[PDB]
Amino acid sequence: TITANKRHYLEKVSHQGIISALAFDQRGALKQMMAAHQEGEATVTQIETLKVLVSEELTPYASSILLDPEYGLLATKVRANQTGLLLAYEKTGYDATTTSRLPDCLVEWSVKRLKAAGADAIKFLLYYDVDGDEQINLQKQAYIERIGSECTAEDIPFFLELLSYDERISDNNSAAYAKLKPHKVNGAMSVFSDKRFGVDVLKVEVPVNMAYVEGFTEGEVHYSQAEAIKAFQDQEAASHLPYIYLSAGVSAKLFQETLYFAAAAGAQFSGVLCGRATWAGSVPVYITKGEDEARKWLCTEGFQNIDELNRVLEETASPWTEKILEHH
Amino acid sequence: TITANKRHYLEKVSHQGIISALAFDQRGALKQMMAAHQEGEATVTQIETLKVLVSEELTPYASSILLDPEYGLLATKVRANQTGLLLAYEKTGYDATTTSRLPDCLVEWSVKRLKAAGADAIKFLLYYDVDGDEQINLQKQAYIERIGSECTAEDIPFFLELLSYDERISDNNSAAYAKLKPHKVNGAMSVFSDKRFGVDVLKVEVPVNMAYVEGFTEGEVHYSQAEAIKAFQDQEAASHLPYIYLSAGVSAKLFQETLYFAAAAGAQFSGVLCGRATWAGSVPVYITKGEDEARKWLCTEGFQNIDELNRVLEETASPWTEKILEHH
């Protein structure tokens, strides 16, 4: 169930029950994107600045923005009036040499400090393999419980981001992984739907890899349209909690088509936390052509991406007001 | 402010506003004491068994018992009727090669699970140098906030144990540390008295090293009685929260003499969490002579230790009902 104070915060990150939220808590991934356009490492100024620009120019078209508290704090100060704030709570990345991918909170933060920094919602990313080591998964469940309790005490929405994986498979983009994806994504959602975790909204992947779905590829087809529909219906049945889709690395167009497919399949998602699809193109422009030109790109191409996305959301998304349970 | 549920739980670990608590969450320290009487590493069995025995025979004489959830789970089940339970939440010990001594929760636990395991109160041990690295202390402050928030959400008493230290001094027993103890202990208490930490009871050291106070030793003297009195008065001024004394490594006799001295000085402690002084002598008996002999020792020498302590407690301690602020 949802509390009155949590609901009131949830309304801040939404518009009319729909979360049309801009994702820009990327840290490692952004450093990589920037590195492919210049000689040196990305500086603190560069990361802080592009986040400021994206915040300034695109939050007028988003119901909320997700930012990291490491680099994105300047960007929290420059939001358009109606734009809610989500702050990431996890340390970025994982040790790829080991299999466990254990969760770890930013050492300088607590939910109380995140709330004090303006957060309307707490976000935490957990890598989860539902078929993985049981003691590792006990470890992960205890960790989420702690964070859920923090969010219960501070009476603020907890958004749990679930990234599925397999202990034995390095590459999430492989065909071998694609066959397993529905099981990993839906099984994880199902585990973290238990009241014990205090989750208010799930932020999840689409249950299939669209690159291997009939009608979306020139190559190997691992699911028919009907099979992909079934995987979305399974996602819909996997939880009772509201959920929003993360875009991962896909283009504005593929994501948009994914949302149409999702809605046609009967998936009832309350929004998206869309990142790279919207702002990826500003990275080359900012790094090579400077600050002023990046601003122009955001107000034209960047706006086009986000505005198209909002149009699709308006047609496809199901308000969380349909799903949320009141605490009276 | 104390909540009605938190107070009800706190009553379970107390008798008439006084916490006469038996402390047996020792892990590393117990392994050390056992290794002094046999050849090898102490077995899991041995640690679990002695905890069961001390619990079985001495909890009839304590308002509560403190246990660790790593080895003490068997011992939780053998408590006398009136005896409440506190469970430790921290990983035992610390890396002695670095100065930071950063807090870290047992990876398999959350406050929720500690409650599920029967805890009436949650104890967490933090090493704190009030004069230490500011960013390290920020880390520690954030960390306690998380734990405090957990305990607020689960509506369960949070006992914060503060062990003071100096970043430059490894040995707490030394004369060099003795001169610094009052400032370290009282300063730490003062910091963690802020509402933001959600602490209900402070578990703290006596502010001086009694073994170096005039009148308590033949040998080196580092405080006059007038100076020891001042340290106890500063301790009483350091917080508004109820606090209880840990006995650390000191003998039953010196602990009792400390309590009388503390009360004379004006210290208003609400009880003790007393460990080694009470049961230490059962350790050689159990390892060398076995189960039955340890039991006879607990029912005789062990009872004597605790019964004398309780008598002194009755004369010296001030009930926490004199200090706690109700929520309405």
From Swiss-Prot, chains A, B:
Return the SMART domains for the record.
DeoC (SM01133)
**Enzyme Commission designation:** 4.1.2.40
Judging by the UniProt lineage, the source's domain of life is Bacteria
Q: Which Gene Ontology biological process is one annotated for this entry? A: 6-sulfoquinovose(1-) catabolic process
Query: What UniProt keywords are attached to this protein's entry?
Result: Lactose metabolism, Lyase
Q: Name one GO molecular function term.
A: 6-deoxy-6-sulfofructose-1-phosphate aldolase activity
**Entry keyword annotation includes Lipoprotein:** no
Chain coiled-coil ranges: none
Catalysed reaction(s) here are: D-tagatofuranose 1,6-bisphosphate = D-glyceraldehyde 3-phosphate + dihydroxyacetone phosphate
Q: Which InterPro entries match?
A: Aldolase_TIM, DeoC/FbaB/LacD_aldolase, LacD_aldolase, Tag_1.6-dipho_adolase
- Metabolic or biological pathway: Carbohydrate metabolism; D-tagatose 6-phosphate degradation; D-glyceraldehyde 3-phosphate and glycerone phosphate from D-tagatose 6-phosphate: step 2/2
Query: What family is this protein classified in?
Result: Belongs to the aldolase LacD family.
Protein name per the record: Tagatose 1,6-diphosphate aldolase 1
Organism of provenance:
Streptococcus pyogenes serotype M1
